[PDB]
Amino acid sequence: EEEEERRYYRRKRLGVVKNVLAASTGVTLTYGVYLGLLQMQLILHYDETYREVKYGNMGLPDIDSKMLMGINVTPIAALLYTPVLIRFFGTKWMMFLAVGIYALFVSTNYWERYYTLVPSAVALGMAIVPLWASMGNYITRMSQKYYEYSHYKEQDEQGPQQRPPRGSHAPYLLVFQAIFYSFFHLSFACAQLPMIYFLNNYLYDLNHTLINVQSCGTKSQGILNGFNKTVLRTLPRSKNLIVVESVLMAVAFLAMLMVLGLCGAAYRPTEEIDLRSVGWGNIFQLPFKHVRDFRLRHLVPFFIYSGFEVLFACTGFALGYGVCSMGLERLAYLLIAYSLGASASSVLGLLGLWLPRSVPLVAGAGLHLLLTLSLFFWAPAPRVLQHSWIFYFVAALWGVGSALNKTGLSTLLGILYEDKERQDFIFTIYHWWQAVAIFVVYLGSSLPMKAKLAVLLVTLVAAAASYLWMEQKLQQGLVPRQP
Amino acid sequence: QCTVRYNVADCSHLKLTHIPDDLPSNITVLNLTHNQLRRLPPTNFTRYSQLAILDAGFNSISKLEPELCQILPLLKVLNLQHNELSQISDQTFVFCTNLTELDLMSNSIHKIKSNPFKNQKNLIKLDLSHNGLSSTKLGTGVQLENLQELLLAKNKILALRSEELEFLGNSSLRKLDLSSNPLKEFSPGCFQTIGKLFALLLNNAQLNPHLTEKLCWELSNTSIQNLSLANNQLLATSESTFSGLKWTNLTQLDLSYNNLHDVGNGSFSYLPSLRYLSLEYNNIQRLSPRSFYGLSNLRYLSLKRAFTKQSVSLASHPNIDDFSFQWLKYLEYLNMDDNNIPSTKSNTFTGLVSLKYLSLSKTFTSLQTLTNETFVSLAHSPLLTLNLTKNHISKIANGTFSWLGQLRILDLGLNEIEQKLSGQEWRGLRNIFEIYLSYNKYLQLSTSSFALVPSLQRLMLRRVALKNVDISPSPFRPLRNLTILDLSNNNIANINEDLLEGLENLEILDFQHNNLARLWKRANPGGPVNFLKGLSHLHILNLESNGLDEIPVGVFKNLFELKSINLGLNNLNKLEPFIFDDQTSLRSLNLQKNLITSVEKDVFGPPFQNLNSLDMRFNPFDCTCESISWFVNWINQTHTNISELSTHYLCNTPHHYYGFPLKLFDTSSCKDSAPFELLFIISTSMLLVFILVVLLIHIE
Numbered sequence A: 001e002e003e004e005e006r007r008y009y010r011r012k013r014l015g016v017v018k019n020v021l022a023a024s025t026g027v028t029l030t031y032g033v034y035l036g037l038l039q040m041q042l043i044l045h046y047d048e049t050y051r052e053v054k055y056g057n058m059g060l061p062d063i064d065s066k067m068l069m070g071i072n073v074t075p076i077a078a079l080l081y082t083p084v085l086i087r088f089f090g091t092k093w094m095m096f097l098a099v100g101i102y103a104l105f106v107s108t109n110y111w112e113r114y115y116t117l118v119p120s121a122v123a124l125g126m127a128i129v130p131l132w133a134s135m136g137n138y139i140t141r142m143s144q145k146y147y148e149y150s151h152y153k154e155q156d157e158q159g160p161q162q163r164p165p166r167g168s169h170a171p172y173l174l175v176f177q178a179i180f181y182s183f184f185h186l187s188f189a190c191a192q193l194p195m196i197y198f199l200n201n202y203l204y205d206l207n208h209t210l211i212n213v214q215s216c217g218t219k220s221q222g223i224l225n226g227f228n229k230t231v232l233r234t235l236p237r238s239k240n241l242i243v244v245e246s247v248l249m250a251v252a253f254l255a256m257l258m259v260l261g262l263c264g265a266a267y268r269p270t271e272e273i274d275l276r277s278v279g280w281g282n283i284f285q286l287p288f289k290h291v292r293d294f295r296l297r298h299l300v301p302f303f304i305y306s307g308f309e310v311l312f313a314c315t316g317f318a319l320g321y322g323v324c325s326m327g328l329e330r331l332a333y334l335l336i337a338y339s340l341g342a343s344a345s346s347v348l349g350l351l352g353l354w355l356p357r358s359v360p361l362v363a364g365a366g367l368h369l370l371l372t373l374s375l376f377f378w379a380p381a382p383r384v385l386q387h388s389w390i391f392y393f394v395a396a397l398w399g400v401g402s403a404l405n406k407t408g409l410s411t412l413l414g415i416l417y418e419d420k421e422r423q424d425f426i427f428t429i430y431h432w433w434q435a436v437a438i439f440v441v442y443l444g445s446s447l448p449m450k451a452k453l454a455v456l457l458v459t460l461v462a463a464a465a466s467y468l469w470m471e472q473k474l475q476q477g478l479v480p481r482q483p
Numbered sequence B: 001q002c003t004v005r006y007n008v009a010d011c012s013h014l015k016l017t018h019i020p021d022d023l024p025s026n027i028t029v030l031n032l033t034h035n036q037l038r039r040l041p042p043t044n045f046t047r048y049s050q051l052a053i054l055d056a057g058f059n060s061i062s063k064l065e066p067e068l069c070q071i072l073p074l075l076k077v078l079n080l081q082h083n084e085l086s087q088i089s090d091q092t093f094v095f096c097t098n099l100t101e102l103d104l105m106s107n108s109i110h111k112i113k114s115n116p117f118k119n120q121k122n123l124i125k126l127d128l129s130h131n132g133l134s135s136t137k138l139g140t141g142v143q144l145e146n147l148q149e150l151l152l153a154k155n156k157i158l159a160l161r162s163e164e165l166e167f168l169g170n171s172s173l174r175k176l177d178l179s180s181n182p183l184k185e186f187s188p189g190c191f192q193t194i195g196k197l198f199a200l201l202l203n204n205a206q207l208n209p210h211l212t213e214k215l216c217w218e219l220s221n222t223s224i225q226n227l228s229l230a231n232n233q234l235l236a237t238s239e240s241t242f243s244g245l246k247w248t249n250l251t252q253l254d255l256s257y258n259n260l261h262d263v264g265n266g267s268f269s270y271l272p273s274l275r276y277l278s279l280e281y282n283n284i285q286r287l288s289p290r291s292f293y294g295l296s297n298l299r300y301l302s303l304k305r306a307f308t309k310q311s312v313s314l315a316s317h318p319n320i321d322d323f324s325f326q327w328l329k330y331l332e333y334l335n336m337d338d339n340n341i342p343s344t345k346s347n348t349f350t351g352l353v354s355l356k357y358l359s360l361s362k363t364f365t366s367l368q369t370l371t372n373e374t375f376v377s378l379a380h381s382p383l384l385t386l387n388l389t390k391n392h393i394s395k396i397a398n399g400t401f402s403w404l405g406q407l408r409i410l411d412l413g414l415n416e417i418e419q420k421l422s423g424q425e426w427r428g429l430r431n432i433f434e435i436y437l438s439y440n441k442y443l444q445l446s447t448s449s450f451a452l453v454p455s456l457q458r459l460m461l462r463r464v465a466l467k468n469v470d471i472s473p474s475p476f477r478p479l480r481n482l483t484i485l486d487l488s489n490n491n492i493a494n495i496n497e498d499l500l501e502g503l504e505n506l507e508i509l510d511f512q513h514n515n516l517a518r519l520w521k522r523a524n525p526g527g528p529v530n531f532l533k534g535l536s537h538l539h540i541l542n543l544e545s546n547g548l549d550e551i552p553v554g555v556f557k558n559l560f561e562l563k564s565i566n567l568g569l570n571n572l573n574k575l576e577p578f579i580f581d582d583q584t585s586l587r588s589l590n591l592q593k594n595l596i597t598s599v600e601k602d603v604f605g606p607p608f609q610n611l612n613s614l615d616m617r618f619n620p621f622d623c624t625c626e627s628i629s630w631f632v633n634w635i636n637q638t639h640t641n642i643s644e645l646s647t648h649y650l651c652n653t654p655h656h657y658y659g660f661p662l663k664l665f666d667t668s669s670c671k672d673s674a675p676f677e678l679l680f681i682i683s684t685s686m687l688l689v690f691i692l693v694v695l696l697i698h699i700e
């Protein structure tokens, strides 16, 4: 029976690709809801009217700073309690629990009080890193399963029973991670839906919220050194607010349900027992013992730079340069333009399959380098609306660079390590270093300028990144063996 | 145009010239005052021929149309005051029969040589005042059968002949007015021609003693009851002056503004039926016992400003002899307000067996100190009301009011009394009800001050500089039947707790301007004094302008019958909850010019349930949801009276809402409005249950 097996493996490949698309769309919806709610809460709390009239003596800046610190410092404990927890719950089960913690953070935003919002921030900071770690592990293992099914179909007896791929699953992993990251970046534009439809028509023009701005651009001396006290021309009706937040909760629950229903199960009880056979006492030290790896010692600055540049695109650009001329009316437009640029660069890098591995990577960084130049000398004037297309130009270019660098890091980390425990370990370390970079940039607030550190880091990693590739061709020979 | 209400037409201050026709046809009142009508066209009143009364005063009508009275047969009240009606003809009022009241208060009518009052047999009130009439002749034959009120004041009448009054053959005339006319002589038999004369007024008639003597002789053998000679030139009275009035049954006599130098002995003897006597505003220099002889049935007498003036150039004091009012045994009301009598003699008020009401405000200029022998004359008189304000009283001796046993209302206010209240001054006042000690200079309370007066029901201490109030026992303790207690502007810093104890009958309490801030806040001897312990029947309460910055909880407990609270001009900012819980029958609440910031439900619930009127202007509200959301939601829905709502209700904070009216504040953008409170709990519960259930299910 040949055609029956053909149909069987066709259903299998269809299930693989549909679970991949489901996980991608779940990432999209969850991250979009999270960014939208976070932005709405940070903007709605920067005024006197909504702070004193609705709440008064509740301490909105204090609870906001406590939420921020609980989200930004908990990744340490997250790393301290992620590997054994992921191997306990599972690859898709930690995905589901982290999406549930995100939805919990969205839910506890209705009343907004200390004892209900601070634990939510702690849980979010605990679940942010292992969410992405398990996501990368799941998507890479599913790409490997897709490739192994394809090569079992095309090669029945020619394919060995042990070790099918041998570093050849790149054409099937590139096309998966490209669409995954394009959807993750389209999430950034989807996050701008509540602001455009509900919040963009409640704040006045830039002629009043941008008065006390005497120095912007290269002379920032902080995230927001000069700004008006209030930005809302009128108080937002609570009915529209509850409507938009109910829509957010509904789409979050829809993402929850579609993930649960279309993710299936990719843990494989046999391999689950295999991983349990490792033990609980040695799994706690193995990620820390993996420091002796030759690749991680040079790839850690790459993770730091990825985190630095993604947080610069999130806050350093929207609140540092886009706020110069125009106020908060065209910031969501800059964000969606950056998102579309990243989504386009996703397929632009997908088209880079024929070229070898470490070709666009440093080039992407080089892009930032060029952009960094334009971010060092040129300084836009705040009280003028002359040239506005250059902002969208730099936003699109930074999106291209960021998406290219992120997808290159993902594909390289999936290619260099093909084993399941290796995949989980390296993804965990990479995402922990990214969280540490985010925390450092959080500590890097209220600073004069973060461009010199950024450019020195990009120049330290370009040479370093090339460095790592120059020794793999000469056959150095080193790999940690912790079975 | 003209305002229409219930069968009336308010068409006055509109400056209209023509006759309006837009008014309904079933109307009965027409008010056209202060307009510029030239005349009344008798053709345009056909549409509303059912008019009952007509008012066309303050206009310039020159002639009246006789048809005007036949086209509206329901005309009963006709009023043409301040018009320019030149001459009256014979056929003018010859069709007017249903007429009842004719008012011609000003038309400059000089001569009337016809019989215009022949057919108005239903006429009751006639007014021809402020005209140029020189004779009281209104016709030839007897007419005006139902005439009762005839007014002829402010005319140029020089004589009252007997022939020019024969038309009142048998007409029961009730009120006759000849004021402001310089009559020089009275013809004999003139008043005898009138069928019945009840009242007669000659105010400002420029009579003399001989003139009023001849008038009194002419006024013999008639039924006159009320007589007024006010604003006259009656310099002095004699016995023969009022000799004619003995036959008639006079009831009320008025002698005001006559500048009477003196009263002759026995000049009032010939009158035995006099009941009301008025001697206001004269310059009497001497009084004698024989002067008031013959006034047996006198019941009303007033001597307001009846004595000699101050006379700064030459010092003169009018003296009154003893036994001046002994003949007045039936006198009930006696008044000598604003006089210059030096003091009270031993037997001034002797002989008044039935004196009940006596007013002595500003009568004595040098009384100063009362004595027990001062009120000895009034011992046999059952006085019920006595007034001593504006008397410059300084001291009160022991047993001064002992003779006045049946005294009920006593007034000592507006004086300079500077003495301690020992308590023996009120001896003998068993039936006293109200005591007025307001606006006095300086007093000192004592434990036995009000002990002899348990039956007291009203007491006033406004502006007295009260001292020694915080003593045990409370001086107000024996006042078992005390109902109204008024002490304001005393500046009493320390008040003991035992004060106002056992005062169950206490209903009204005034406590304005006494500085009660230090006593309540956090007292050094202990805690809140809560002097309102058992004042259950308290109804009206006032604590304005004491500068209190907080209200202790429990001071208003067991205060059910309380109706009104006045806490204006205070410094309170924070109000403890459950302070107004017993205030369920509250009607009026005043909190103005305070430091109130937030109004909350747990504080203002019970009082706002049945509150009638409230005043809370001039207050710095905090225009925030958590502060005033329930306040705005209540004031929007409720219908209670609010004075100056959108004008003096402002918000000082926040700075964005500085100088913004409280009514324009919107509560839709508040936390309590939207149900995210329930939405959060239901979403969190559902999500936690879902996660836990699915995780425990797929694990096993």
Ligand SMILES: *[C@@H]1O[C@H](CO)[C@@H](O[C@@H]2O[C@H](CO)[C@@H](O[C@@H]3O[C@H](CO)[C@@H](O)[C@H](O)[C@@H]3O)[C@H](O)[C@H]2NC(C)=O)[C@H](O)[C@H]1NC(C)=O
Binding pocket: B361, B387, B388, B389, B409, B410, B411
């Ligand atoms: C004893 O005689 C005095 C003086 O005749 C009486 O005083 C009178 O008290 C009444 C009640 O307060 C006054 O009426 C009020 O006057 C104020 C102005 O002061 C006015 O704003 C109020 O609307 C009200 O009309 C009255 O004016 C006052 N008399 C005088 C001449 O000022 C007193 O009541 C007498 N004691 C009795 C009758 O027991």
Ligand SMILES: *[C@@H]1O[C@H](CO)[C@@H](O[C@@H]2O[C@H](CO)[C@@H](O)[C@H](O)[C@H]2NC(C)=O)[C@H](O)[C@H]1NC(C)=O
Binding pocket: A208, A209, A211, A212, A227, A228, A229, A230
């Ligand atoms: C925030 O903006 C408001 C106006 O939108 C500023 O208020 C102005 O302050 C200046 C100071 O002299 C006044 O001359 C203007 O009349 C004010 N405008 C108003 C009240 O509408 C306020 O100063 C700004 N604050 C900051 C920190 O920039």
Ligand SMILES: *[C@@H]1O[C@H](CO)[C@@H](O[C@@H]2O[C@H](CO)[C@@H](O)[C@H](O)[C@H]2NC(C)=O)[C@H](O)[C@H]1NC(C)=O
Binding pocket: B372, B373
């Ligand atoms: C009014 O008070 C005076 C003084 O209190 C009384 O004068 C007393 O008169 C008696 C007999 O006439 C003397 O024995 C006392 O020595 C007097 N002085 C006193 C008691 O201090 C006067 O009698 C009183 N008048 C009336 C009518 O009782």
Ligand SMILES: *[C@@H]1O[C@H](CO)[C@@H](O[C@@H]2O[C@H](CO)[C@@H](O)[C@H](O)[C@H]2NC(C)=O)[C@H](O)[C@H]1NC(C)=O
Binding pocket: B398, B422, B423, B424, B446, B448
């Ligand atoms: C009026 O009567 C009072 C009664 O209260 C007299 O005051 C008392 O005088 C005696 C005499 O030494 C004292 O022992 C008491 O302590 C006083 N009582 C009070 C409450 O002070 C007062 O002397 C009498 N005055 C006149 C003029 O007779």
Ligand SMILES: *[C@@H]1O[C@H](CO)[C@@H](O[C@@H]2O[C@H](CO)[C@@H](O)[C@H](O)[C@H]2NC(C)=O)[C@H](O)[C@H]1NC(C)=O
Binding pocket: B454, B455, B456, B480, B481
């Ligand atoms: C307080 O007021 C009450 C009510 O009038 C007084 O009680 C009256 O007393 C008289 C005298 O014995 C009786 O004739 C009445 O029948 C009582 N009326 C009532 C309703 O009980 C009482 O006497 C007053 N107290 C004082 C100290 O005067």
Ligand SMILES: *[C@@H]1O[C@H](CO)[C@@H](O)[C@H](O)[C@H]1NC(C)=O
Binding pocket: A207, A385
């Ligand atoms: C408002 O902003 C516009 C931006 O183009 C500017 O041209 C205009 O002069 C401003 N109006 C003011 C500052 O009153």
Ligand SMILES: *[C@@H]1O[C@H](CO)[C@@H](O)[C@H](O)[C@H]1NC(C)=O
Binding pocket: B012, B029, B031, B032, B033, B053, B055
């Ligand atoms: C007519 O109106 C005036 C002023 O409005 C008023 O004084 C007068 O009493 C009124 N007369 C009648 C009869 O309504």
Ligand SMILES: *[C@@H]1O[C@H](CO)[C@@H](O)[C@H](O)[C@H]1NC(C)=O
Binding pocket: B073, B074, B097, B098
């Ligand atoms: C007075 O009015 C009544 C009611 O319309 C009418 O019948 C009568 O003729 C009028 N004249 C009189 C009573 O002289």
Ligand SMILES: *[C@@H]1O[C@H](CO)[C@@H](O)[C@H](O)[C@H]1NC(C)=O
Binding pocket: B142, B169, B170
């Ligand atoms: C009133 O007097 C007139 C004549 O003067 C007479 O005709 C008429 O009957 C009298 N009326 C009464 C009620 O006496």
Ligand SMILES: *[C@@H]1O[C@H](CO)[C@@H](O)[C@H](O)[C@H]1NC(C)=O
Binding pocket: B174, B175, B198, B199, B225, B226, B252, B276
């Ligand atoms: C006469 O005077 C008494 C007492 O003031 C009064 O009741 C009565 O109405 C008066 N009568 C007239 C006609 O004025």
Ligand SMILES: *[C@@H]1O[C@H](CO)[C@@H](O)[C@H](O)[C@H]1NC(C)=O
Binding pocket: B221, B247
């Ligand atoms: C007035 O009445 C008295 C008492 O009845 C009487 O003697 C006298 O004759 C009367 N005089 C006239 C003029 O009627």
Ligand SMILES: *[C@@H]1O[C@H](CO)[C@@H](O)[C@H](O)[C@H]1NC(C)=O
Binding pocket: B263, B264, B265, B288, B290
């Ligand atoms: C009243 O009698 C007194 C005392 O005999 C006397 O001095 C006075 O002159 C008399 N007055 C008149 C007006 O007779």
Ligand SMILES: *[C@@H]1O[C@H](CO)[C@@H](O)[C@H](O)[C@H]1NC(C)=O
Binding pocket: B588, B612, B613, B641
């Ligand atoms: C409240 O206003 C109504 C209507 O003006 C009035 O009838 C009522 O007496 C007022 N109540 C108070 C307590 O002022």
Ligand SMILES: *[C@@H]1O[C@H](CO)[C@@H](O)[C@H](O)[C@H]1NC(C)=O
Binding pocket: B636, B637, B638
């Ligand atoms: C409440 O306020 C609104 C707007 O000011 C007004 O239209 C409404 O009539 C108010 N409520 C009541 C019961 O009058």
